[PDB]
mmCIF file with all atom_site columns, N, CA and C in Angstrom:
data_model
loop_
_atom_site.group_PDB
_atom_site.id
_atom_site.type_symbol
_atom_site.label_atom_id
_atom_site.label_alt_id
_atom_site.label_comp_id
_atom_site.label_asym_id
_atom_site.label_entity_id
_atom_site.label_seq_id
_atom_site.pdbx_PDB_ins_code
_atom_site.Cartn_x
_atom_site.Cartn_y
_atom_site.Cartn_z
_atom_site.occupancy
_atom_site.B_iso_or_equiv
_atom_site.pdbx_formal_charge
_atom_site.auth_seq_id
_atom_site.auth_comp_id
_atom_site.auth_asym_id
_atom_site.auth_atom_id
_atom_site.pdbx_PDB_model_num
ATOM 1   N N  . UNK A 1 1  ? 7.722   1.640  48.061 1.00 59.29 ? 1  UNK A N  1
ATOM 2   C CA . UNK A 1 1  ? 6.558   1.889  46.883 1.00 59.29 ? 1  UNK A CA 1
ATOM 3   C C  . UNK A 1 1  ? 6.334   3.357  46.595 1.00 59.29 ? 1  UNK A C  1
ATOM 4   N N  . UNK A 1 2  ? 6.899   3.947  45.984 1.00 59.15 ? 2  UNK A N  1
ATOM 5   C CA . UNK A 1 2  ? 6.833   5.536  45.950 1.00 59.15 ? 2  UNK A CA 1
ATOM 6   C C  . UNK A 1 2  ? 7.468   5.857  44.553 1.00 59.15 ? 2  UNK A C  1
ATOM 7   N N  . UNK A 1 3  ? 6.763   6.192  43.706 1.00 62.00 ? 3  UNK A N  1
ATOM 8   C CA . UNK A 1 3  ? 7.576   6.817  42.126 1.00 62.00 ? 3  UNK A CA 1
ATOM 9   C C  . UNK A 1 3  ? 7.874   8.452  42.166 1.00 62.00 ? 3  UNK A C  1
ATOM 10  N N  . UNK A 1 4  ? 8.073   8.834  43.441 1.00 61.45 ? 4  UNK A N  1
ATOM 11  C CA . UNK A 1 4  ? 8.343   10.155 43.580 1.00 61.45 ? 4  UNK A CA 1
ATOM 12  C C  . UNK A 1 4  ? 7.253   10.780 43.155 1.00 61.45 ? 4  UNK A C  1
ATOM 13  N N  . UNK A 1 5  ? 6.541   11.030 44.260 1.00 61.45 ? 5  UNK A N  1
ATOM 14  C CA . UNK A 1 5  ? 5.323   12.191 43.539 1.00 61.45 ? 5  UNK A CA 1
ATOM 15  C C  . UNK A 1 5  ? 4.981   13.698 44.341 1.00 61.45 ? 5  UNK A C  1
ATOM 16  N N  . UNK A 1 6  ? 5.482   14.142 43.332 1.00 64.07 ? 6  UNK A N  1
ATOM 17  C CA . UNK A 1 6  ? 5.360   15.839 43.966 1.00 64.07 ? 6  UNK A CA 1
ATOM 18  C C  . UNK A 1 6  ? 4.638   16.691 43.021 1.00 64.07 ? 6  UNK A C  1
ATOM 19  N N  . UNK A 1 7  ? 4.426   17.885 43.696 1.00 64.29 ? 7  UNK A N  1
ATOM 20  C CA . UNK A 1 7  ? 3.418   18.553 42.990 1.00 64.29 ? 7  UNK A CA 1
ATOM 21  C C  . UNK A 1 7  ? 3.988   19.528 41.705 1.00 64.29 ? 7  UNK A C  1
ATOM 22  N N  . UNK A 1 8  ? 4.478   18.965 40.884 1.00 64.59 ? 8  UNK A N  1
ATOM 23  C CA . UNK A 1 8  ? 4.999   19.589 39.324 1.00 64.59 ? 8  UNK A CA 1
ATOM 24  C C  . UNK A 1 8  ? 4.324   19.354 38.509 1.00 64.59 ? 8  UNK A C  1
ATOM 25  N N  . UNK A 1 9  ? 3.637   20.455 37.754 1.00 64.27 ? 9  UNK A N  1
ATOM 26  C CA . UNK A 1 9  ? 2.702   20.219 36.257 1.00 64.27 ? 9  UNK A CA 1
ATOM 27  C C  . UNK A 1 9  ? 2.688   21.486 35.933 1.00 64.27 ? 9  UNK A C  1
ATOM 28  N N  . UNK A 1 10 ? 2.963   21.662 34.384 1.00 64.03 ? 10 UNK A N  1
ATOM 29  C CA . UNK A 1 10 ? 2.758   22.259 33.845 1.00 64.03 ? 10 UNK A CA 1
ATOM 30  C C  . UNK A 1 10 ? 2.584   22.064 31.948 1.00 64.03 ? 10 UNK A C  1
ATOM 31  N N  . UNK A 1 11 ? 1.981   23.118 31.448 1.00 65.28 ? 11 UNK A N  1
ATOM 32  C CA . UNK A 1 11 ? 1.803   22.638 29.793 1.00 65.28 ? 11 UNK A CA 1
ATOM 33  C C  . UNK A 1 11 ? 2.676   23.328 28.988 1.00 65.28 ? 11 UNK A C  1
ATOM 34  N N  . UNK A 1 12 ? 2.437   23.061 27.989 1.00 62.53 ? 12 UNK A N  1
ATOM 35  C CA . UNK A 1 12 ? 3.986   24.222 26.457 1.00 62.53 ? 12 UNK A CA 1
ATOM 36  C C  . UNK A 1 12 ? 3.080   23.204 25.536 1.00 62.53 ? 12 UNK A C  1
ATOM 37  N N  . UNK A 1 13 ? 3.388   24.276 24.186 1.00 63.12 ? 13 UNK A N  1
ATOM 38  C CA . UNK A 1 13 ? 3.082   23.443 22.735 1.00 63.12 ? 13 UNK A CA 1
ATOM 39  C C  . UNK A 1 13 ? 4.487   22.984 22.542 1.00 63.12 ? 13 UNK A C  1
ATOM 40  N N  . UNK A 1 14 ? 3.874   22.009 21.325 1.00 65.10 ? 14 UNK A N  1
ATOM 41  C CA . UNK A 1 14 ? 4.729   20.903 20.869 1.00 65.10 ? 14 UNK A CA 1
ATOM 42  C C  . UNK A 1 14 ? 4.867   21.203 19.270 1.00 65.10 ? 14 UNK A C  1
ATOM 43  N N  . UNK A 1 15 ? 5.796   20.348 18.542 1.00 67.68 ? 15 UNK A N  1
ATOM 44  C CA . UNK A 1 15 ? 5.722   20.557 17.171 1.00 67.68 ? 15 UNK A CA 1
ATOM 45  C C  . UNK A 1 15 ? 4.956   19.033 16.583 1.00 67.68 ? 15 UNK A C  1
ATOM 46  N N  . UNK A 1 16 ? 4.427   19.422 15.248 1.00 66.96 ? 16 UNK A N  1
ATOM 47  C CA . UNK A 1 16 ? 3.799   17.282 14.453 1.00 66.96 ? 16 UNK A CA 1
ATOM 48  C C  . UNK A 1 16 ? 4.530   16.960 14.151 1.00 66.96 ? 16 UNK A C  1
ATOM 49  N N  . UNK A 1 17 ? 6.004   16.944 14.005 1.00 68.25 ? 17 UNK A N  1
ATOM 50  C CA . UNK A 1 17 ? 6.819   15.955 13.808 1.00 68.25 ? 17 UNK A CA 1
ATOM 51  C C  . UNK A 1 17 ? 7.007   15.345 15.143 1.00 68.25 ? 17 UNK A C  1
ATOM 52  N N  . UNK A 1 18 ? 8.067   15.942 16.156 1.00 67.03 ? 18 UNK A N  1
ATOM 53  C CA . UNK A 1 18 ? 8.507   15.037 17.245 1.00 67.03 ? 18 UNK A CA 1
ATOM 54  C C  . UNK A 1 18 ? 7.364   14.016 17.750 1.00 67.03 ? 18 UNK A C  1
ATOM 55  N N  . UNK A 1 19 ? 5.841   14.911 17.916 1.00 68.90 ? 19 UNK A N  1
ATOM 56  C CA . UNK A 1 19 ? 4.726   14.239 18.499 1.00 68.90 ? 19 UNK A CA 1
ATOM 57  C C  . UNK A 1 19 ? 4.015   12.962 17.309 1.00 68.90 ? 19 UNK A C  1
ATOM 58  N N  . UNK A 1 20 ? 4.518   13.068 16.489 1.00 66.32 ? 20 UNK A N  1
ATOM 59  C CA . UNK A 1 20 ? 4.189   12.236 15.464 1.00 66.32 ? 20 UNK A CA 1
ATOM 60  C C  . UNK A 1 20 ? 5.080   10.842 16.036 1.00 66.32 ? 20 UNK A C  1
ATOM 61  N N  . UNK A 1 21 ? 6.006   10.845 16.438 1.00 64.65 ? 21 UNK A N  1
ATOM 62  C CA . UNK A 1 21 ? 6.776   9.838  17.131 1.00 64.65 ? 21 UNK A CA 1
ATOM 63  C C  . UNK A 1 21 ? 6.194   9.243  18.166 1.00 64.65 ? 21 UNK A C  1
ATOM 64  N N  . UNK A 1 22 ? 5.828   10.433 18.951 1.00 65.10 ? 22 UNK A N  1
ATOM 65  C CA . UNK A 1 22 ? 5.595   9.976  20.262 1.00 65.10 ? 22 UNK A CA 1
ATOM 66  C C  . UNK A 1 22 ? 4.303   9.363  20.483 1.00 65.10 ? 22 UNK A C  1
ATOM 67  N N  . UNK A 1 23 ? 3.108   10.057 20.053 1.00 67.62 ? 23 UNK A N  1
ATOM 68  C CA . UNK A 1 23 ? 1.534   9.689  19.702 1.00 67.62 ? 23 UNK A CA 1
ATOM 69  C C  . UNK A 1 23 ? 1.629   8.182  19.400 1.00 67.62 ? 23 UNK A C  1
ATOM 70  N N  . UNK A 1 24 ? 2.442   8.261  18.307 1.00 66.53 ? 24 UNK A N  1
ATOM 71  C CA . UNK A 1 24 ? 2.429   6.865  17.983 1.00 66.53 ? 24 UNK A CA 1
ATOM 72  C C  . UNK A 1 24 ? 2.638   6.413  18.659 1.00 66.53 ? 24 UNK A C  1
ATOM 73  N N  . UNK A 1 25 ? 3.784   5.523  19.493 1.00 65.23 ? 25 UNK A N  1
ATOM 74  C CA . UNK A 1 25 ? 4.486   5.562  20.562 1.00 65.23 ? 25 UNK A CA 1
ATOM 75  C C  . UNK A 1 25 ? 3.484   4.642  21.315 1.00 65.23 ? 25 UNK A C  1
ATOM 76  N N  . UNK A 1 26 ? 2.824   6.098  22.326 1.00 64.82 ? 26 UNK A N  1
ATOM 77  C CA . UNK A 1 26 ? 1.589   6.091  23.270 1.00 64.82 ? 26 UNK A CA 1
ATOM 78  C C  . UNK A 1 26 ? 0.329   5.028  22.720 1.00 64.82 ? 26 UNK A C  1
ATOM 79  N N  . UNK A 1 27 ? 0.624   4.165  21.615 1.00 66.43 ? 27 UNK A N  1
ATOM 80  C CA . UNK A 1 27 ? -0.434  3.293  20.825 1.00 66.43 ? 27 UNK A CA 1
ATOM 81  C C  . UNK A 1 27 ? 0.346   2.086  20.811 1.00 66.43 ? 27 UNK A C  1
ATOM 82  N N  . UNK A 1 28 ? 1.796   2.212  20.738 1.00 63.68 ? 28 UNK A N  1
ATOM 83  C CA . UNK A 1 28 ? 2.231   0.770  21.241 1.00 63.68 ? 28 UNK A CA 1
ATOM 84  C C  . UNK A 1 28 ? 2.387   0.022  22.070 1.00 63.68 ? 28 UNK A C  1
ATOM 85  N N  . UNK A 1 29 ? 2.878   1.295  23.440 1.00 61.37 ? 29 UNK A N  1
ATOM 86  C CA . UNK A 1 29 ? 3.177   1.334  24.637 1.00 61.37 ? 29 UNK A CA 1
ATOM 87  C C  . UNK A 1 29 ? 2.527   2.123  25.664 1.00 61.37 ? 29 UNK A C  1
ATOM 88  N N  . UNK A 1 30 ? 1.941   2.057  26.356 1.00 59.64 ? 30 UNK A N  1
ATOM 89  C CA . UNK A 1 30 ? 1.361   3.166  27.548 1.00 59.64 ? 30 UNK A CA 1
ATOM 90  C C  . UNK A 1 30 ? 2.920   3.134  28.388 1.00 59.64 ? 30 UNK A C  1
ATOM 91  N N  . UNK A 1 31 ? 3.191   2.056  28.669 1.00 61.46 ? 31 UNK A N  1
ATOM 92  C CA . UNK A 1 31 ? 4.247   2.321  29.713 1.00 61.46 ? 31 UNK A CA 1
ATOM 93  C C  . UNK A 1 31 ? 5.457   1.906  29.543 1.00 61.46 ? 31 UNK A C  1
ATOM 94  N N  . UNK A 1 32 ? 6.154   2.856  28.991 1.00 62.32 ? 32 UNK A N  1
ATOM 95  C CA . UNK A 1 32 ? 7.713   3.036  27.605 1.00 62.32 ? 32 UNK A CA 1
ATOM 96  C C  . UNK A 1 32 ? 8.732   2.507  28.928 1.00 62.32 ? 32 UNK A C  1
ATOM 97  N N  . UNK A 1 33 ? 9.244   2.072  28.855 1.00 61.42 ? 33 UNK A N  1
ATOM 98  C CA . UNK A 1 33 ? 10.702  2.157  29.698 1.00 61.42 ? 33 UNK A CA 1
ATOM 99  C C  . UNK A 1 33 ? 11.664  2.737  29.396 1.00 61.42 ? 33 UNK A C  1
ATOM 100 N N  . UNK A 1 34 ? 12.577  2.896  30.745 1.00 61.19 ? 34 UNK A N  1
ATOM 101 C CA . UNK A 1 34 ? 14.042  3.737  30.398 1.00 61.19 ? 34 UNK A CA 1
ATOM 102 C C  . UNK A 1 34 ? 14.266  3.920  28.939 1.00 61.19 ? 34 UNK A C  1
ATOM 103 N N  . UNK A 1 35 ? 14.645  2.188  28.423 1.00 61.18 ? 35 UNK A N  1
ATOM 104 C CA . UNK A 1 35 ? 15.778  2.473  27.509 1.00 61.18 ? 35 UNK A CA 1
ATOM 105 C C  . UNK A 1 35 ? 14.485  3.449  26.486 1.00 61.18 ? 35 UNK A C  1
ATOM 106 N N  . UNK A 1 36 ? 13.426  3.123  25.892 1.00 61.40 ? 36 UNK A N  1
ATOM 107 C CA . UNK A 1 36 ? 12.342  3.915  24.797 1.00 61.40 ? 36 UNK A CA 1
ATOM 108 C C  . UNK A 1 36 ? 12.259  5.336  25.604 1.00 61.40 ? 36 UNK A C  1
ATOM 109 N N  . UNK A 1 37 ? 12.498  5.309  26.556 1.00 61.67 ? 37 UNK A N  1
ATOM 110 C CA . UNK A 1 37 ? 12.519  6.911  26.809 1.00 61.67 ? 37 UNK A CA 1
ATOM 111 C C  . UNK A 1 37 ? 13.513  7.627  26.842 1.00 61.67 ? 37 UNK A C  1
ATOM 112 N N  . UNK A 1 38 ? 14.972  7.127  26.497 1.00 60.74 ? 38 UNK A N  1
ATOM 113 C CA . UNK A 1 38 ? 15.996  7.911  26.114 1.00 60.74 ? 38 UNK A CA 1
ATOM 114 C C  . UNK A 1 38 ? 16.124  7.898  25.179 1.00 60.74 ? 38 UNK A C  1
ATOM 115 N N  . UNK A 1 39 ? 15.143  6.680  24.487 1.00 61.03 ? 39 UNK A N  1
ATOM 116 C CA . UNK A 1 39 ? 15.620  6.653  22.692 1.00 61.03 ? 39 UNK A CA 1
ATOM 117 C C  . UNK A 1 39 ? 14.611  7.605  22.288 1.00 61.03 ? 39 UNK A C  1
ATOM 118 N N  . UNK A 1 40 ? 13.277  7.951  22.936 1.00 59.42 ? 40 UNK A N  1
ATOM 119 C CA . UNK A 1 40 ? 12.282  8.520  22.232 1.00 59.42 ? 40 UNK A CA 1
ATOM 120 C C  . UNK A 1 40 ? 13.095  10.242 22.519 1.00 59.42 ? 40 UNK A C  1
ATOM 121 N N  . UNK A 1 41 ? 13.488  10.494 23.428 1.00 60.08 ? 41 UNK A N  1
ATOM 122 C CA . UNK A 1 41 ? 13.780  11.863 23.406 1.00 60.08 ? 41 UNK A CA 1
ATOM 123 C C  . UNK A 1 41 ? 14.878  12.460 22.517 1.00 60.08 ? 41 UNK A C  1
ATOM 124 N N  . UNK A 1 42 ? 14.993  11.498 21.428 1.00 62.96 ? 42 UNK A N  1
ATOM 125 C CA . UNK A 1 42 ? 16.488  11.840 20.644 1.00 62.96 ? 42 UNK A CA 1
ATOM 126 C C  . UNK A 1 42 ? 15.743  11.756 19.154 1.00 62.96 ? 42 UNK A C  1
ATOM 127 N N  . UNK A 1 43 ? 14.527  10.771 19.352 1.00 63.07 ? 43 UNK A N  1
ATOM 128 C CA . UNK A 1 43 ? 13.908  11.257 18.206 1.00 63.07 ? 43 UNK A CA 1
ATOM 129 C C  . UNK A 1 43 ? 12.977  12.224 17.715 1.00 63.07 ? 43 UNK A C  1
ATOM 130 N N  . UNK A 1 44 ? 12.260  12.485 18.994 1.00 64.36 ? 44 UNK A N  1
ATOM 131 C CA . UNK A 1 44 ? 11.676  13.972 18.884 1.00 64.36 ? 44 UNK A CA 1
ATOM 132 C C  . UNK A 1 44 ? 12.725  14.921 19.630 1.00 64.36 ? 44 UNK A C  1
ATOM 133 N N  . UNK A 1 45 ? 13.911  14.880 20.818 1.00 59.08 ? 45 UNK A N  1
ATOM 134 C CA . UNK A 1 45 ? 14.823  15.765 20.577 1.00 59.08 ? 45 UNK A CA 1
ATOM 135 C C  . UNK A 1 45 ? 14.297  16.150 22.362 1.00 59.08 ? 45 UNK A C  1
ATOM 136 N N  . UNK A 1 46 ? 13.598  16.013 22.660 1.00 56.91 ? 46 UNK A N  1
ATOM 137 C CA . UNK A 1 46 ? 12.893  16.500 24.321 1.00 56.91 ? 46 UNK A CA 1
ATOM 138 C C  . UNK A 1 46 ? 13.818  16.143 25.262 1.00 56.91 ? 46 UNK A C  1
ATOM 139 N N  . UNK A 1 47 ? 13.461  16.049 26.149 1.00 56.54 ? 47 UNK A N  1
ATOM 140 C CA . UNK A 1 47 ? 14.250  15.281 27.780 1.00 56.54 ? 47 UNK A CA 1
ATOM 141 C C  . UNK A 1 47 ? 13.512  14.409 27.993 1.00 56.54 ? 47 UNK A C  1
ATOM 142 N N  . UNK A 1 48 ? 14.250  13.437 28.666 1.00 55.82 ? 48 UNK A N  1
ATOM 143 C CA . UNK A 1 48 ? 13.583  12.292 29.168 1.00 55.82 ? 48 UNK A CA 1
ATOM 144 C C  . UNK A 1 48 ? 11.921  13.090 30.095 1.00 55.82 ? 48 UNK A C  1
ATOM 145 N N  . UNK A 1 49 ? 12.299  14.183 31.030 1.00 54.52 ? 49 UNK A N  1
ATOM 146 C CA . UNK A 1 49 ? 11.842  14.529 31.783 1.00 54.52 ? 49 UNK A CA 1
ATOM 147 C C  . UNK A 1 49 ? 10.166  14.975 31.554 1.00 54.52 ? 49 UNK A C  1
ATOM 148 N N  . UNK A 1 50 ? 10.224  16.109 30.147 1.00 54.37 ? 50 UNK A N  1
ATOM 149 C CA . UNK A 1 50 ? 9.194   16.713 29.145 1.00 54.37 ? 50 UNK A CA 1
ATOM 150 C C  . UNK A 1 50 ? 8.822   15.455 28.841 1.00 54.37 ? 50 UNK A C  1
ATOM 151 N N  . UNK A 1 51 ? 9.580   14.136 28.441 1.00 55.14 ? 51 UNK A N  1
ATOM 152 C CA . UNK A 1 51 ? 8.510   12.715 27.780 1.00 55.14 ? 51 UNK A CA 1
ATOM 153 C C  . UNK A 1 51 ? 7.522   12.326 28.962 1.00 55.14 ? 51 UNK A C  1
ATOM 154 N N  . UNK A 1 52 ? 8.512   11.731 29.612 1.00 57.31 ? 52 UNK A N  1
ATOM 155 C CA . UNK A 1 52 ? 7.121   11.184 30.912 1.00 57.31 ? 52 UNK A CA 1
ATOM 156 C C  . UNK A 1 52 ? 5.870   11.978 31.346 1.00 57.31 ? 52 UNK A C  1
ATOM 157 N N  . UNK A 1 53 ? 6.448   12.971 31.643 1.00 56.77 ? 53 UNK A N  1
ATOM 158 C CA . UNK A 1 53 ? 5.309   13.490 31.874 1.00 56.77 ? 53 UNK A CA 1
ATOM 159 C C  . UNK A 1 53 ? 4.186   13.741 30.824 1.00 56.77 ? 53 UNK A C  1
ATOM 160 N N  . UNK A 1 54 ? 4.310   14.385 29.287 1.00 56.45 ? 54 UNK A N  1
ATOM 161 C CA . UNK A 1 54 ? 3.867   14.467 28.287 1.00 56.45 ? 54 UNK A CA 1
ATOM 162 C C  . UNK A 1 54 ? 2.884   12.932 28.478 1.00 56.45 ? 54 UNK A C  1
ATOM 163 N N  . UNK A 1 55 ? 3.713   11.729 28.560 1.00 57.54 ? 55 UNK A N  1
ATOM 164 C CA . UNK A 1 55 ? 3.123   10.564 27.996 1.00 57.54 ? 55 UNK A CA 1
ATOM 165 C C  . UNK A 1 55 ? 2.264   11.141 29.090 1.00 57.54 ? 55 UNK A C  1
ATOM 166 N N  . UNK A 1 56 ? 2.595   10.996 30.875 1.00 52.19 ? 56 UNK A N  1
ATOM 167 C CA . UNK A 1 56 ? 1.322   11.187 31.759 1.00 52.19 ? 56 UNK A CA 1
ATOM 168 C C  . UNK A 1 56 ? -0.069  11.398 31.195 1.00 52.19 ? 56 UNK A C  1
ATOM 169 N N  . UNK A 1 57 ? 0.330   13.195 30.919 1.00 54.16 ? 57 UNK A N  1
ATOM 170 C CA . UNK A 1 57 ? -0.248  13.675 30.766 1.00 54.16 ? 57 UNK A CA 1
ATOM 171 C C  . UNK A 1 57 ? -1.850  13.099 29.699 1.00 54.16 ? 57 UNK A C  1
ATOM 172 N N  . UNK A 1 58 ? -1.166  12.030 28.713 1.00 58.43 ? 58 UNK A N  1
ATOM 173 C CA . UNK A 1 58 ? -2.023  11.416 27.500 1.00 58.43 ? 58 UNK A CA 1
ATOM 174 C C  . UNK A 1 58 ? -2.989  10.516 28.151 1.00 58.43 ? 58 UNK A C  1
ATOM 175 N N  . UNK A 1 59 ? -2.471  9.700  29.359 1.00 60.51 ? 59 UNK A N  1
ATOM 176 C CA . UNK A 1 59 ? -3.560  9.233  29.928 1.00 60.51 ? 59 UNK A CA 1
ATOM 177 C C  . UNK A 1 59 ? -4.597  9.629  30.483 1.00 60.51 ? 59 UNK A C  1
ATOM 178 N N  . UNK A 1 60 ? -4.534  10.436 31.143 1.00 60.63 ? 60 UNK A N  1
ATOM 179 C CA . UNK A 1 60 ? -4.994  11.623 31.356 1.00 60.63 ? 60 UNK A CA 1
ATOM 180 C C  . UNK A 1 60 ? -6.168  11.865 30.766 1.00 60.63 ? 60 UNK A C  1
ATOM 181 N N  . UNK A 1 61 ? -5.952  12.294 29.581 1.00 60.23 ? 61 UNK A N  1
ATOM 182 C CA . UNK A 1 61 ? -6.377  13.281 28.487 1.00 60.23 ? 61 UNK A CA 1
ATOM 183 C C  . UNK A 1 61 ? -7.184  12.442 27.969 1.00 60.23 ? 61 UNK A C  1
ATOM 184 N N  . UNK A 1 62 ? -6.471  11.042 27.764 1.00 61.94 ? 62 UNK A N  1
ATOM 185 C CA . UNK A 1 62 ? -7.674  9.834  26.959 1.00 61.94 ? 62 UNK A CA 1
ATOM 186 C C  . UNK A 1 62 ? -8.749  9.265  27.022 1.00 61.94 ? 62 UNK A C  1
ATOM 187 N N  . UNK A 1 63 ? -8.640  9.092  28.546 1.00 63.64 ? 63 UNK A N  1
ATOM 188 C CA . UNK A 1 63 ? -9.754  8.576  29.780 1.00 63.64 ? 63 UNK A CA 1
ATOM 189 C C  . UNK A 1 63 ? -10.812 9.379  29.596 1.00 63.64 ? 63 UNK A C  1
ATOM 190 N N  . UNK A 1 64 ? -10.729 10.863 28.685 1.00 63.45 ? 64 UNK A N  1
ATOM 191 C CA . UNK A 1 64 ? -12.029 11.627 28.803 1.00 63.45 ? 64 UNK A CA 1
ATOM 192 C C  . UNK A 1 64 ? -12.638 10.996 27.450 1.00 63.45 ? 64 UNK A C  1
ATOM 193 N N  . UNK A 1 65 ? -11.904 11.651 26.177 1.00 62.13 ? 65 UNK A N  1
ATOM 194 C CA . UNK A 1 65 ? -12.311 11.296 25.515 1.00 62.13 ? 65 UNK A CA 1
ATOM 195 C C  . UNK A 1 65 ? -12.413 9.214  25.034 1.00 62.13 ? 65 UNK A C  1
ATOM 196 N N  . UNK A 1 66 ? -12.083 8.420  25.773 1.00 62.55 ? 66 UNK A N  1
ATOM 197 C CA . UNK A 1 66 ? -12.362 7.004  25.684 1.00 62.55 ? 66 UNK A CA 1
ATOM 198 C C  . UNK A 1 66 ? -13.569 6.770  26.399 1.00 62.55 ? 66 UNK A C  1
ATOM 199 N N  . UNK A 1 67 ? -14.164 7.412  27.206 1.00 63.43 ? 67 UNK A N  1
ATOM 200 C CA . UNK A 1 67 ? -15.494 7.217  27.603 1.00 63.43 ? 67 UNK A CA 1
ATOM 201 C C  . UNK A 1 67 ? -16.907 8.228  26.579 1.00 63.43 ? 67 UNK A C  1
ATOM 202 N N  . UNK A 1 68 ? -16.320 9.445  26.135 1.00 62.31 ? 68 UNK A N  1
ATOM 203 C CA . UNK A 1 68 ? -16.986 10.002 25.382 1.00 62.31 ? 68 UNK A CA 1
ATOM 204 C C  . UNK A 1 68 ? -17.395 9.487  23.952 1.00 62.31 ? 68 UNK A C  1
ATOM 205 N N  . UNK A 1 69 ? -18.799 9.456  23.321 1.00 64.91 ? 69 UNK A N  1
ATOM 206 C CA . UNK A 1 69 ? -19.093 8.819  22.468 1.00 64.91 ? 69 UNK A CA 1
ATOM 207 C C  . UNK A 1 69 ? -18.097 8.187  21.472 1.00 64.91 ? 69 UNK A C  1
ATOM 208 N N  . UNK A 1 70 ? -17.446 9.262  21.261 1.00 65.86 ? 70 UNK A N  1
ATOM 209 C CA . UNK A 1 70 ? -15.869 9.234  20.000 1.00 65.86 ? 70 UNK A CA 1
ATOM 210 C C  . UNK A 1 70 ? -15.386 7.980  20.336 1.00 65.86 ? 70 UNK A C  1
ATOM 211 N N  . UNK A 1 71 ? -15.618 7.024  19.350 1.00 67.92 ? 71 UNK A N  1
ATOM 212 C CA . UNK A 1 71 ? -14.866 6.085  19.548 1.00 67.92 ? 71 UNK A CA 1
ATOM 213 C C  . UNK A 1 71 ? -14.424 4.818  18.468 1.00 67.92 ? 71 UNK A C  1
ATOM 214 N N  . UNK A 1 72 ? -13.306 4.288  18.515 1.00 66.24 ? 72 UNK A N  1
ATOM 215 C CA . UNK A 1 72 ? -12.852 3.578  17.148 1.00 66.24 ? 72 UNK A CA 1
ATOM 216 C C  . UNK A 1 72 ? -13.127 1.687  17.150 1.00 66.24 ? 72 UNK A C  1
ATOM 217 N N  . UNK A 1 73 ? -12.430 1.374  16.450 1.00 62.86 ? 73 UNK A N  1
ATOM 218 C CA . UNK A 1 73 ? -13.087 0.105  16.390 1.00 62.86 ? 73 UNK A CA 1
ATOM 219 C C  . UNK A 1 73 ? -14.603 -0.632 16.538 1.00 62.86 ? 73 UNK A C  1
ATOM 220 N N  . UNK A 1 74 ? -15.064 -1.407 15.809 1.00 63.79 ? 74 UNK A N  1
ATOM 221 C CA . UNK A 1 74 ? -16.382 -2.175 15.698 1.00 63.79 ? 74 UNK A CA 1
ATOM 222 C C  . UNK A 1 74 ? -16.781 -2.340 17.324 1.00 63.79 ? 74 UNK A C  1
ATOM 223 N N  . UNK A 1 75 ? -18.176 -1.263 17.422 1.00 64.19 ? 75 UNK A N  1
ATOM 224 C CA . UNK A 1 75 ? -19.094 -1.286 19.054 1.00 64.19 ? 75 UNK A CA 1
ATOM 225 C C  . UNK A 1 75 ? -20.033 -1.196 18.648 1.00 64.19 ? 75 UNK A C  1
ATOM 226 N N  . UNK A 1 76 ? -20.758 -1.847 20.343 1.00 64.13 ? 76 UNK A N  1
ATOM 227 C CA . UNK A 1 76 ? -22.372 -1.796 20.126 1.00 64.13 ? 76 UNK A CA 1
ATOM 228 C C  . UNK A 1 76 ? -22.970 -2.007 21.132 1.00 64.13 ? 76 UNK A C  1
ATOM 229 N N  . UNK A 1 77 ? -24.031 -2.175 21.465 1.00 64.37 ? 77 UNK A N  1
ATOM 230 C CA . UNK A 1 77 ? -24.593 -2.469 22.406 1.00 64.37 ? 77 UNK A CA 1
ATOM 231 C C  . UNK A 1 77 ? -24.620 -4.259 22.874 1.00 64.37 ? 77 UNK A C  1
ATOM 232 N N  . UNK A 1 78 ? -24.417 -4.845 21.803 1.00 63.59 ? 78 UNK A N  1
ATOM 233 C CA . UNK A 1 78 ? -24.343 -6.286 22.194 1.00 63.59 ? 78 UNK A CA 1
ATOM 234 C C  . UNK A 1 78 ? -23.504 -6.531 23.111 1.00 63.59 ? 78 UNK A C  1
ATOM 235 N N  . UNK A 1 79 ? -24.088 -7.668 23.884 1.00 59.04 ? 79 UNK A N  1
ATOM 236 C CA . UNK A 1 79 ? -23.423 -7.996 25.409 1.00 59.04 ? 79 UNK A CA 1
ATOM 237 C C  . UNK A 1 79 ? -21.820 -8.120 24.856 1.00 59.04 ? 79 UNK A C  1
ATOM 238 N N  . UNK A 1 80 ? -20.969 -7.191 25.491 1.00 61.97 ? 80 UNK A N  1
ATOM 239 C CA . UNK A 1 80 ? -19.554 -7.177 25.384 1.00 61.97 ? 80 UNK A CA 1
ATOM 240 C C  . UNK A 1 80 ? -18.679 -7.048 26.655 1.00 61.97 ? 80 UNK A C  1
#
């Protein structure tokens, strides 16, 4: 019951092309399976690792803009 927990983190820059494929996917599937990972490593060129991380970082980042005022779709005070 451990998906390998180690203290390894780093930040790097990315292009607008490769990302387009990744970011777009993030919306399709937050938890991409190996197949998807290996498939993305090509559509973007990055490596499985780089992908796995980047994706994981997103979930953390979004959580921020998610609670912040900024938001999509129709929503309001209406009991929901």
